[model samples]
Structures are given as structure tokens and as C-alpha cells.
Target: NRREEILQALAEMLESNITTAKLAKQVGVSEAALYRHFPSKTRMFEGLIEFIEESLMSRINRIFDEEKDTLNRIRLVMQLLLAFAERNPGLTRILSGHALMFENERLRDRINQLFERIETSLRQILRERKLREGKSFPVDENILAAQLLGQVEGSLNRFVRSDFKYLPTANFDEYWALLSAQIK
Candidate 1:
């Protein structure tokens, strides 16, 4: 659990833009001791990304499988995203790619892939709905998926930029209604 403790420290450090020394101090370890657990700060960040991937994917799979209706599934996915961001401000920064800035380029790519997976899941649900309704979409499922995810990420970006004052879930119901109507 030392690694987990270190990662938690890393996440907190990211939220406040603290340095490695500060992180080690806060975690009750020397920088050398931290390095013993993680060979490098990059590896520590990798641990954070892994945690984000596992946490999101678990909930994503659950929402996709347990929810029967396509529209509801899509709604739930967006809801889960916003709720997660609200609950984990530090991880939200990581998800938004803000925390990865100036770190390894690969970290940003990993976060991008995370969003891509979310978009793909949205596409699958929308594609199924189009088939069931027997109506051609005005936009390609790919575009729709990207747009939905863009809105979600854009919301997160705004939330972070505003110092978390503007919550990602703000006016979610009305906004989702608008988005769903557009999709319909």
C-alpha cells in the first residue's frame, strides 16, 4: 500500500502544483525513499493513470451492461463522468489532461485514449439506438460520439479553469435534455 500512498500524495500535489520534495514530505518520506517505491516521478504518474483507467472502466462497463435503454445508458455515462469529476478533483485534473502538462507526453496520450474509449462507448450506444429506431442519423455516429465527449471534456476543462467553481454537473439535467433532443 506504499505505492497507493505515494500516488495519493502525487494526486494531491498535482492539485496544488506542489514539487516532488513537498510531495515526499507530505507523504512522510524522503525523496530517496519515494524513489525506492517509484523509480521515477513519471512512474508515479503512471500509477495515477492506471487508477483512473481502472476506476472509470469499471463504472463504464457496469453502466453499459446494466442499463437497458440506449438513451439512458448515454445519459448515465455522462452523469457518471460529471459525478466522478466532482468527487475527485485531483483525478479530474488528470482526466482533463491539465495535471499532465509539462510531464511526459505519453501521459497526455494515455488520457486522450481514456477519452477515446468513452467516446467509443457512446458511439456504440448511439449506433444501436439508430438501428432500433430505423432512422438514419443526421450526423455520423463517430461525430456524434466525439461531440458528446467534447461537451463532457469541455465541461471538465471549464470546471478546472474556474478553480472548480463551475461544477461539471451544473445544470446537467437541462443540458442533457438539450443534448438528447439534438441527438433525437
Candidate 2:
């Protein structure tokens, strides 16, 4: 119970201050307490990052599991991401690079890797659609993935930084047409 509390506190602390020292202070614990539970501060950061990665991957995989149509799967992925960010405001700050100021170089790299993995998954889904339709995708999945991912990230960032004043899906419906046409 205590260990989980430490981890949860660390994750919450990450929302405002990504720095290890600040996190240590915010949790009302010392660096030694953190090290007692985690091998290193990096490990602590990794724990939160893993929480983020797992949460997202599980949802995306579930959407794909139920949606057999490749295009529909893509739409589901879009909806899933926006919804996740909407629900997890703190994690959205991390996902969208708002937490960069609090992160060390290694932690930043870890975060970047997380984004790359998501992009790769997006590209794979796009390739699947292209094959299913028996037509060449005019858009490079990797590039298109990058753009859509950026839009989602940008929207999430705006929403969180604005204290949730803006809904991340505010323009999603209108933009979906543009996304579908452009990514084709």
C-alpha cells in the first residue's frame, strides 16, 4: 500500500514538477525514500511512463480487437486517444511534452520513445488499411501518423494547459473528414 502510494504521489507530482527533487519534496518524502522504493530516480520516472504506455496501448488494442475494419479501427484509435487525454489530464501534460521542463535528459528520451512507439503503431494500422483496400495509400503512413499524432498531442496540450477549458475533441468531427481525405 505504501509503495503504491509513493508511486501515485510521484505520478501526481510529475504533473506540476517533473524534476526528481521537486517530486521528492512533494511526496513528503526524501530522496532516500524514493530510492528505497525505486532503484533510481530514473526508475521512478519509468514507472510513471510505463503507466502511461500501458494505459494507452491497452485501450488501443481493445479498440482494434473489436473493430475489424481497418478504417474504422483508425477512427477508433483517434477517439481513444482524445478520450484518454480528456480523462487523464495530468498524463496528457506528460504525453504532450508539457512535462518536459521537469524531466531529465534520460526521462525526456523515454518520453520521446513512447511517442515514437505510438507513431509506429499508427503506421502499421495505416499499412493494414492500404492492403485491405487493395489500393496504394497516397499518404505515407509514418508521415501521416506523425501529423495526426501531433494534432492529437497539440489539442491535448492546449486543453490541459488551458486548465481543461478547451475540449480536445472540439474540432474532431469536422477534422475527421480532412484526416480521412488527407490520409487516403
Candidate 3:
């Protein structure tokens, strides 16, 4: 409970000081007590990072379990991820590189890898659809996957640019329909 309180506190706080003295005070605990749970500040951020990876992967896999329309899977992936970012404003700060900016070069790499993994997963779905349906995909799986991933990256950038004022999923279906129309 305390760990989540600390993490959630850190999340809410990032929208605006990350100093542990204030952070601990924000959570009504001493800095020494905070360290008892999380060894370091960066380590706490890593805990947040771990949730990003875990959340996305599980969400994607869960969709596969219940949804069979390959093309629709791509749309759902993008939609759900943006919605996740929409709800967690602080994580968006991390995802869009605003918070991670000038913080840790290493964390950015982790974020990049997360994007790469997302691209690969999309590519796999593309590859799956094309092989089964035949003459449907307009380009190679990698190209389409990268393009879809780019759409997500841009949407995220927009969401962060406006301080999450414009929800990405709010317009998700309208924009996705335009591209879905062209998927032939």
C-alpha cells in the first residue's frame, strides 16, 4: 500500500518537484523510510517503468486472446495504449520523453526499446493477416508496423504537447477510420 502510495504520489507530482525530501513529505514518510522500500529515486522510477512494460504487454496479449480480426487488433492496440496514457498523465510524461528529458539517458533507451517491442508486435499481427488473407497488405509488415507505430508516437506527442487537454482516444475512431479505409 505504501509503495503504491509513493508511486502514485510520484506520478501525480510529475505533472508539475521530485525531490525525495518533498516526495517523502508528500507521502507522510521520512526519506529514510522511503529508502527502506525503494533503494533510490531512480529505482522508484524504474518501478514505474516496469509497470509500463508489464501493462502494455499484458493488454496486447489479452486482446489476442479474445479478438480475432487482425486489422482490428492494430486499431485496438493503438486505442488502448493512448487511453492508458490519457488516464495516467504522469506516464505520458515518461512515454513522450518530456519527463525523461535530460533525466536519464538510460531510461530513454528503455522507452525506445518499448517502442521497438510495440512495433514488432504490430508487425507480427500484420504478417499474420497478410499470410492468411493474401493480397491485402499494401506493404511489408515492418513498414506498416512502423507506420502504425509512428501514428501512435505522434498522437502521444500531441497529447503531451497540450498537457493532455486533448484526449487521443477521443478522436481515435475518427482518425483510425481514415487509415482503416486505406488498409486495402
Candidate 4:
């Protein structure tokens, strides 16, 4: 429980500048106590990342399992991303690379991999829907997926850069409509 709490606080700290000592102070623990639970600050960051993956992938999996409509599933996937960013500004910083600028290279790689997986999912959905439409995709599916994902990443980056004042989900309906129109 304390570890989760620490990770939550760490995520919050990531929205701004932070250090191990500062983090420990925020969590009401000595730096040594923090180390007792986590081997290093990097490990603590890894913990937050693990939490992010587990939290997001589980829900995304459910969307895949229950949603039969490919377009709806893809739309919801993008919506979920924006909603999560809006809900977790701190995590958005991590997702958008703002927080990992000074962290280990592996941390940035992990987040990049996450984005790649999401793009792959988007490609899959669009490919399947195109097949059902009995027509080939007018454009490259890979590029389509990347573009869609880029929009999300860009939105999250803006939200974080704006000090969380700009909500990622702002005008989501209009943007989703525009994105879907372009994809079709």
C-alpha cells in the first residue's frame, strides 16, 4: 500500500521537477526508508510505469474483447487515452516524454514501446474495417495508425506543457469526428 502511495506521489512529482530526496519528503518518509522499499529512484519510476501499463492495457484489452465494431473500438481506444491523460496529468507527462527527459533511456524506450503497441492496435482495427468495407485502404495503414496516435501524443504533450491547464479531452468529439473522417 505504501509502495503504491509512493508511486502515486512520484507520478504527481513527475509533473514538475523532482529528486529522490524531494520525493521522499513529499511521501513523509526518509530517503533511506524510500530506498528500503525501492532499490533506487529509477526503480520507483519503473514501478510507476508498470502501474501505467497494467492500468491501461487491462482496460484496452476489455475494449478489444467486448467491442465488435472496429471503428467504435478504435474511437474508444483514442478516447480512453485522452480521458486517462486528462484524469492523470502526472502520468500524461510520462506518456508524452516530458518526465523521462532526464530519466534512464530504458524508461523512454518503454513508453515508446507502449505507443508502438497502441499504434499497432489502431492499424489492426483499421485494416479489419477496411476489409469489411470490401475495399483496400486508400492510404497506408501504418501511416494512418501513426498519424492517429501522433494526434493523441500531441494532445497529451500540449496538456503537460500547459501545466495541465489544457485538458486533453477538450473538443474531443469534434476532433474525433475529424480524425475519423480522415481515416475513412
State which candidate has the highest lDDT.
4
Residue-level lDDT of model 4, residues 69-164, one tens digit each, is 887898999999999889888777777777544368867777777788788888888888888865466688888898889889889999989988
Candidate 3 has its poorest 10 consecutive residues by lDDT at: 99-108
Candidate 2 lDDT, 74-128, residue by residue in tens: 7778888898778778777766767644457767887877777787778888888
Candidate 1 per-residue lDDT over residues 35-98, each given as its tens digit: 8876776666766777777778899899878998888898999999998888777778767766
Q: Candidate 1 or 4, higher TM-score? A: 1
lDDT of each: 0.80, 0.76, 0.79, 0.81
Among all windows of ten consecutive residues in candidate 4, which has the lowest summed lDDT? 94-103
Model 4: residues with Cα > 4 Å off, grouped in runs: 1-9, 12-37, 100-103, 132-135
Q: What's model 1's TM-score?
A: 0.81
Clashes counted in candidate 3 amount to: 0
Best-to-worst ranking by TM-score: 3, 1, 4, 2
